[PDB]
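tool_call predict_complex ligand=adenosine-5'-triphosphate
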Amino acid sequence: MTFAHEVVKSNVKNQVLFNGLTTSKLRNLMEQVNRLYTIAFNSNEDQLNEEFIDELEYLKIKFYYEAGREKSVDEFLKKTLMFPIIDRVIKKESKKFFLDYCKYFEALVAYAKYYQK
Amino acid sequence: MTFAHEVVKSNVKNQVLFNGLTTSKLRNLMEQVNRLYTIAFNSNEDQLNEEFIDELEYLKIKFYYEAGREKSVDEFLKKTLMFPIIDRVIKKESKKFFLDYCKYFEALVAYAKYYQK
Amino acid sequence: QDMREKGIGSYVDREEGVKRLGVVRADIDNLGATFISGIPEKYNSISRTATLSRQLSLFFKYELNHLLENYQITAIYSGGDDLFLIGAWDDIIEASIYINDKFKEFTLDKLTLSAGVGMFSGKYPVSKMAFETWDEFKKNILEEKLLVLQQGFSQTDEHGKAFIYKMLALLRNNEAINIARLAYLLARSKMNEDFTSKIFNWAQNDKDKNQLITALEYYI
Amino acid sequence: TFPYENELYYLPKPLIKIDSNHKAFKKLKYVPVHHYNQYLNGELSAEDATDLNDIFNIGYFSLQTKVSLIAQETDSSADSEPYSVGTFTFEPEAGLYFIAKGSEETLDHLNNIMTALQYSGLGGKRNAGYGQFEYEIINNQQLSKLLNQNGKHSILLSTAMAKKEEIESALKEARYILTKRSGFVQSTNYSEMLVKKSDFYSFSSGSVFKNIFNGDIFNVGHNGKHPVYRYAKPLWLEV
Amino acid sequence: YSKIKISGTIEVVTGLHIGGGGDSPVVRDLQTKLPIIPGSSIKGKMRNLLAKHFGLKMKQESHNQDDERVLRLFGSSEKGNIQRARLQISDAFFSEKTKEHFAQNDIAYTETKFENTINRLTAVANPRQIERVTRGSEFDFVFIYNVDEESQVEDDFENIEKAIHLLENDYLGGGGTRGNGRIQFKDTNIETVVGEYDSTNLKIK
Amino acid sequence: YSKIKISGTIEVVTGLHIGGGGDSPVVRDLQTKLPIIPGSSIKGKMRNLLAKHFGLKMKQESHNQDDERVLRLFGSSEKGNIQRARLQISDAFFSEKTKEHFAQNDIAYTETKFENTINRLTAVANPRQIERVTRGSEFDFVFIYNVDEESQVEDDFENIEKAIHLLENDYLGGGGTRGNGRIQFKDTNIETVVGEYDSTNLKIK
Amino acid sequence: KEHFAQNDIAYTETKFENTINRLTAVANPRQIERVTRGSEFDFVFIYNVDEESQVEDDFENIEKAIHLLENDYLGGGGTRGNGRIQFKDTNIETVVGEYDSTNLKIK
RNA sequence: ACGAGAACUAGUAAUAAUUGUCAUUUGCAU
Ligand SMILES: Nc1ncnc2c1ncn2[C@@H]1O[C@H](COP(=O)(O)OP(=O)(O)OP(=O)(O)O)[C@@H](O)[C@H]1O
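tool_result ok
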């Protein structure tokens, strides 16, 4: 897939990144995603427990909070389809798709970090 | 592309190597490479798993991230044609070519390890 | 300490190297011509060929006895142009070199010797070891490469037969990937930069690497 | 038996009196079929002798070590008794070959027996894993030509011994080597160690003769329940 | 003459370092590139600890002449009173169940834990790195026991029970005192593979 | 010949930062991806403290040759002396009670702690991020004691209880001077797992 | 041969070993070479049936022998954990004479 | 009726032993 790859090169303008996105501005999101990663990894079955569903709900809440806090994060989340992807992940309730999302978002962050001021 | 393996001797300047590359900074890459070398080696057929294709995608992700973290690693990766060969190996999806890349990369690592401060 | 004659194991049990035997055979290359053709057209009497015969005979029937003194070797059959000596591995090589040089002295570098030395285990039927059996070897192999190698191992311990045998494993398979691997191994060793550098430069060259193989094999 | 390589076939050196080194020819044993008439007529040179010797790599020798633990190592503290065997190995295009002659019926029988034999051995420690073979019958034009000449001398290609009443006229002008041929026998009397053929001498496989002699299958038998045969019949090469 | 096969799996509790290669890597099969436990390791550790169980004198320390019945189980055949060995310890190989497990959940087959050394009067640290086999790995082992004397089966299996139990409270490989290489045995099995001997009354915890 | 087991629990008082694997991560297993306390760390720390309690000279500080009784307790086998270790320490693993507790109270396992340096005559900060094991978590340990001789067991466990007290008032891990690494010991249990020795009069605080 | 060449596997493994002295605990290492796992050897046996009425008995004996070798070792150090072999792909054919062999059996 | 025929280069022992991923450095100037 790696739409992250060509998207990150589509967002290099004149230089600002996503209108000035920086790696310090995604720390909380990275922490939350990492904790959900380790918790889901600890899980055995593929069916997502209702508690992990509530974790995903709070994760959605946190994306929305951060996107309301800053404009560049809002543009990043909007164009990278984070919100639609999270909605679909919540709909599917499958662990493997959540891990695939984790890998995608990690790639996004890695590209954003490699292209910086 | 073997000139890309012996460029390492052409890059002994004045004394630091690759502008201060150390094999110690290559550890995560070496670990991942060994992991998937073992996994591929046990595999029977030449056609790689689609999950193995995603694994190779994860390799490129990690390579870019490491190139972002350190500048010497960035120079090493960029000028030795690591990124194009990774893409090409992903393109042919054949086991023997993946092993060919593994031998090239291991030769790089060992020969670089020959010279260190 | 015991003057009584002892068995073939009396040379096997040397601890300075593997417990094996050495056997050496040598023939004068230009001897058929020398007794027959001799000195052309002006010195070909009975007298002068007779004195040449006597000189070769006395050389092989006294000079060997004296030359072999400092060596752990027993003399089996010697005379005419046949040289058959058996003893300890290292000692046979050293005595063979000494004898070749001392012969080239006495023949004023006119006659050459061809010789073969092999390693034979103790208690083999000697009838069977017999049917199995210069400047280059002395100057290039023994004097330079062997000496630097012995100094290198003497200075740096922990280089047991394991490290040397991994060196062999890399060397005998003549491949470039093996050259990189050998570079890694020498890098992981703790020899002085001079020793490692010399070994690697020799390893890059076919003639030098064969000579290096022979020299380190002799080390063991 | 006479060895071969990839496409070269070999016969032994005739012990013929060549008048010139007397060194390069001594170290030589076999002369291939290409240059054989050249050898018989002096068309072989010393450098050619060196070259032919150089090309003669047709197998190598070895000693394999073995141990025998049937002894009291079964019972109690008792040393093993290592022994040695001598072996020869041929490169992937070497072997040995025969030359046989007789009636057509005799050769058909020989074919049947050879088919039987290819899965038995032809050597020593057959039962311990040495010496099986596969055979092929090929008709080589040149060897046939060499065998079907006509001359005055004769080159003995096998091991023969003339009968009692022909040897005096057989040995008129000859060059030959005798070989004490000995060995034990298989299933004659109770003790193998007690049974051993009487020694027999026969001419070697390169001798040269003026007057042909036919041979005979000579008994080397005594103190036995059945006759034991030794073979002495020549296969002559006439040139 | 009968032979009894003993089968099971070894589960790694804490990381194991056999590592006969010497950086500091572990022994690996050259056909699968996976870690192995050489059978010499099992035989030697059982030898040593079950020897130290019984009498082991200084004169006994000197010669590797050990207790008569441990010697019977493992064989000496060195001097004088010869005894051919009786328990054949095979190697252990990385099981396919755990292979599927770690492949599916994407877990490395080896960790490289980094360790340090604080020397005294200087407090200067010099690092080192060690490879160790990941826990939860499972190795499949086979033992073969030969019945050279019928009446001695019970005592011999009693002693090998002692051996298994004592080994579960000890280590394999190196760095044993540093945490490494504790193992447990699980899903054992006894079955007569050759002969006319019953092996129902037999058990190995 | 017997082996006496010690089992218990490390309570994490303030943060704990081993970080052998390294923004600057901590040591973690790979079968559960939950942190551990390597046994080498515990063993080294106790050895250092208990050595310091006894005599320690500069020449003794030279090449890690330590007082004879601590040497006996932890093994040297270097100065031509026969000393294999008598006390085995294993790793500590993030316990089940902790996992359940943090799951049902919704608290993470690791804190990411940001640190700065203020340059002299410069007043400019260079930030750092240090990740540490969260407080109040508990890890479980197991130790093994070997009785090479009968008449030093009481004395050796007196030494070990002294050492455990010293650890209870010291730090294990990294950056312990700056407020992370204090630990406590609870639920000590003493059994003789293999042998015929009594574990009733023997105690560790 | 072809499998090891393609996957680039050497034909011999070398295991490092070690010995522990008692009262001393100094280790003296050794170096023993070993044939690689998974290698295959092709073999041929011959049975000269000199008695018709005994082939069943003799192949019963050779069956029991091969069964024993299956559960045993070849070569040295088998008590120490090496030498275990397996037998696959056995075929029995009559190559001389007119004796039937479509009923004889070897695993 | 082959200088043959009998004959496991076998038995004993492992990578061990001591090493802490540490030692300083304000989430700081409005
Ligand atoms: N001093 C001598 N005078 C005469 N003949 C000698 C003398 N020394 C040796 N020989 C001859 O050398 C023979 C030995 O032959 P050998 O095969 O050993 O070597 P060679 O054929 O003489 O040497 P090459 O072929 O190298 O010239 C003896 O049998 C003898 O005839």
